[PDB]
């Protein structure tokens, strides 16, 4: 009945020294029935990464929508969109459906190509921007993720150390949620290289 | 319903309208809401007619039995019996009662018992749906130690306004005077009190 917890899933993002990380689980379900273990929730438009939790049809719809909008942006602007600008575009796009909203929990992550400054942000289903210095969480195990991030996180972590912190935050949060898990992906993002790692986790 | 009781120099006077309503139909236009639980302890009834009658009947019984054993009860005692019934059966009752009586030792006394079952001793008391419209008037015009004639005028004028504005109130204004001299009944018809 509740649209935000039919399919299930989670996304988390973190900042480090000259780097950012974004991660998500792979589960898609119909309430108790597990349907797919290959449903990735992180997408990217140029060097800007977007993770989306919530109702899966809206996750797909919004991805296609932000691909549409960022492509037109690039043709007109003659440059790739930046994380700060994209964040505003997500907020605008969600609020225009104020009274008929997309049931989602988006998360933006990326490094500004000019300033080099690491950037993350979160949103509610209707557009409100949460621009945290440390970390952002989203999904059906957001409570669990808040607890993990608040205890495990420290500032100015090196890329390879930040990987361990965010991976352990996701994995242990997912294992305390019935509608999350079934695999996981972690993106490590530096100014001009991005590494993608699939994690081995319990498949129940 | 518009009911009130007022203490004065020589004792206490009870006052009431005579209207009983089933919705907007006046089921009885000449009702007597001033009822007797003892020789010189009376009450004013508002709310459910069935509940307030059943309660009043039980109180009259309790005070009749009290008298046979311990002699004349105080007005405080009568109010306590009313309370005990109203409080302990609050879930199933809809009764707003004013208890008034005359002792020789305590003179005129007035106790009001609203829906909850709480007791409040006061110099005067007002109750019933029509009482809302005369809080302002009664507060401005009430004095302590009034005369009989002044108190009758105060109640007559007060209930006249309550009747004028409240649809649930109307008919004749009944009154009952309680003093050392005895018990006097008064009646005031529409032609008299409407022109005030």
């Amino acid at each position: 009945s509740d649209p935000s917890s039919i399919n299930g899933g989670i996304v988390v993002a973190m900042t480090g020294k000259d780097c950012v990380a974004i991660a998500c689980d792979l589960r898609l379900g119909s309430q108790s029935l597990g349907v797919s273990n290959k449903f990735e929730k992180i997408f990217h438009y140029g060097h800007v990464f977007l993770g989306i939790t919530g109702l899966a049809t809206d996750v797909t719809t919004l991805n296609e929508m932000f691909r549409y909008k960022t492509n037109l942006y690039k043709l007109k602007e003659e440059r790739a969109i930046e994380p700060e600008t994209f964040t505003q575009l997500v907020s605008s796009s969600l609020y225009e459906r104020r009274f008929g909203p997309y049931f989602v929990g988006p998360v933006v992550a990326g490094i500004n190509s000019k300033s080099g400054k690491p950037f993350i942000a979160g949103f509610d289903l209707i557009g409100c921007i949460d621009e945290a210095k440390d970390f952002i969480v989203s999904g059906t195990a957001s409570d669990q993720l808040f607890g993990m991030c608040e205890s495990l996180y420290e500032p100015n972590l090196e890329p390879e150390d930040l990987f361990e912190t965010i991976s352990q935050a996701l994995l242990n949060a997912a294992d305390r949620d019935a509608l999350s898990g079934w695999g996981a992906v972690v993106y490590i993002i530096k100014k001009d290289e991005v590494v993608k790692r699939y994690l081995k986790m319990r498949q129940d | 319903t518009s009911i009130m009781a007022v203490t004065f120099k020589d004792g206490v006077i009870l006052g009431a309208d005579s209207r009983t309503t089933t919705g907007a139909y006046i089921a009885n236009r000449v009702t007597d809401k001033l009822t007797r639980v003892h020789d010189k302890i009376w009450c004013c009834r508002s709310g459910s007619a069935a509940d307030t009658q059943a309660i009043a009947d039980i109180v009259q019984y309790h005070l009749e039995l009290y008298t046979s054993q311990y002699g004349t009860p105080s007005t405080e005692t009568a109010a306590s019996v009313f309370k005990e019934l109203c409080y302990e059966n609050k879930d199933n009752l809809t009764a707003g009662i004013i208890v008034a009586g005359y002792d020789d030792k305590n003179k005129g006394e007035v106790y009001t018992i609203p829906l909850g079952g709480s007791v409040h001793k006061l110099p005067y008391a007002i109750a019933g749906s029509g009482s809302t419209f005369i809080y302002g008037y009664c507060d401005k015009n009430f004095r302590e130690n009034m005369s009989k004639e002044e108190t009758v005028d105060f109640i007559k004028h007060s209930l006249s306004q309550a009747i004028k504005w409240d649809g649930s109130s109307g008919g004749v204004i009944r009154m009952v005077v309680l003093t050392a001299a005895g018990v006097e009944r008064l009646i005031f018809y529409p032609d008299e009190y409407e022109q005030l």
Partner: protein
């Protein structure tokens, strides 16, 4: 929850998962869903944790009193009916129980009764109970025979719970195995699904859908 039990040549196999949930929140992964009523009787737990624990623990006290009074082991039929008659008294009040009562006696042979908080009491060869019961039924029905070895029967039960642990969101944690024979039940270990899944996948060549 996924719990199963089935009769075969070598007695009865009982297998259960370990997960407990409150909504989407995973409350516990280490739940003991098999009750050791006595050295010969086992009870499975599904539905309300408290209802099942309390009344199946109570249940052992009634049986102990029976054999003290009658100088004889209680039958699985009498055992299951004590529980079913008890919950029938509470019918309507809101008890939530899905249970198997499993055992073995000389007069009955290996016996399994399904007992239910609606009052339903059913004797049978195979039963699967819980939110993940349908998943377990798939594996059991296609691979079940009377002529199974204790080794093969144990694995089929283990594998059926694993199947349900994977797909059912409200099942998981670990697998507890029991084997019930002429001389009583024998515990066959706690098996973590986090390790069992990858082991089975590699050796069995199953779950080709998942990447490892």
């Amino acid at each position: 929850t996924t719990t199963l039990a089935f009769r075969f040549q070598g007695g009865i196999i009982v297998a259960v998962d370990s997960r407990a949930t409150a909504g989407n929140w995973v409350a516990s992964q280490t739940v003991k869903k098999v009750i050791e009523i006595n050295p010969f009787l086992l009870g499975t737990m599904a539905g309300g944790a408290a209802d099942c624990q309390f009344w199946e623990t109570w249940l052992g006290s009634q049986f102990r009193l029976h054999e003290l009074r009658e100088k004889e082991r209680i039958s699985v039929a009498a055992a299951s009916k004590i529980l079913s008659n008890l919950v029938y008294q509470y019918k309507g009040a809101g008890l939530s129980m899905g249970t198997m009562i499993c055992g073995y006696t000389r007069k009955e042979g290996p016996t399994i009764y399904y007992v239910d908080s609606d009052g339903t009491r059913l004797k049978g060869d195979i039963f699967c109970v819980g939110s993940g019961q349908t998943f377990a039924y798939g594996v059991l029905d296609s691979n079940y025979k009377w002529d199974l070895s204790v080794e093969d029967a144990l694995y089929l039960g283990k594998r059926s719970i694993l199947a349900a642990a994977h797909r059912d969101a409200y099942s998981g944690g670990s697998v507890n195995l029991y084997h019930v024979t002429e001389d009583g039940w024998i515990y066959h270990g706690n098996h973590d699904v986090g390790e069992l899944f990858w082991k089975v996948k590699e050796e069995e060549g199953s779950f080709n859908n998942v990447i490892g």
